[PDB]
């Protein structure tokens, strides 16, 4: 099973998450493992 973000190419999902502030990012990182990986990747450069 997949979701909206995990179905995107990595760069585009990361790009989507890059519009979120640290707090929103942290909230996003708790939804699932994959989202956690992408969100934490975006936490670098912040």
């Amino acid at each position: 099973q997949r979701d909206f973000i995990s179905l995107l190419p990595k760069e585009l999902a990361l790009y989507v998450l890059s519009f979120l502030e640290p707090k929103d990012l942290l909230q996003a990182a708790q939804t699932c493992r994959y989202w956690r990986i992408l969100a934490e990747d975006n936490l670098l450069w912040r």
């Binding site: 909206f4 890059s18 519009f19 979120l20 929103d24 708790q30 939804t31 956690r36």
Partner: protein, 141 residues
């Protein structure tokens, strides 16, 4: 003041006639036209519906100068189901239309903002594969 047109062919086969200035907001289409001399431009990964959307977006942003807030027209234009939004992201990326990609991705981002993890899960139908310990763990930055 009236420009020539080129043709775009969606993956289903429909051909769209588009003003060249409007169409060339897509860098992809621009290079397939100018450098590869393809007209109609084959778009095997964009269906007719999405292509209609892309063309009306570009047509609407035809005379754009050049801050981060999303214009209301674009907002309403993006009041669509998640599937359409998804395919719009894919198409905007492949077609290399920076503005459309930006506004659509920011729209999705706005669907994430100001929510609890479970609310985000409800929004994007995310399956939880976290255990209680991982949840407790992810709590920490």
């Amino acid at each position: 003041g009236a420009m020539p047109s080129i043709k775009l062919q969606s993956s289903d086969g429909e051909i769209f006639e588009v003003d060249v200035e409007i169409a060339k907001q897509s860098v992809t289409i621009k290079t397939m036209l100018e450098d590869l001399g393809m007209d109609p431009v084959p778009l095997p990964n964009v269906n007719a519906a999405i292509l209609k959307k892309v063309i009306q977006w570009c047509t609407h942003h035809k005379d754009d100068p050049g801050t981060d807030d999303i214009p209301v027209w674009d907002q309403e234009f993006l009041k669509v189901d998640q599937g359409t939004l998804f395919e719009l992201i894919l198409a905007a990326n492949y077609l290399d239309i920076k503005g459309l990609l930006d506004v659509t991705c920011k729209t999705v981002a706005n669907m994430i903002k100001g929510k609890t993890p479970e609310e985000i899960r409800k929004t994007f139908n995310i399956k939880n594969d976290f255990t209680e310990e991982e949840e407790a763990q992810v709590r920490k930055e």
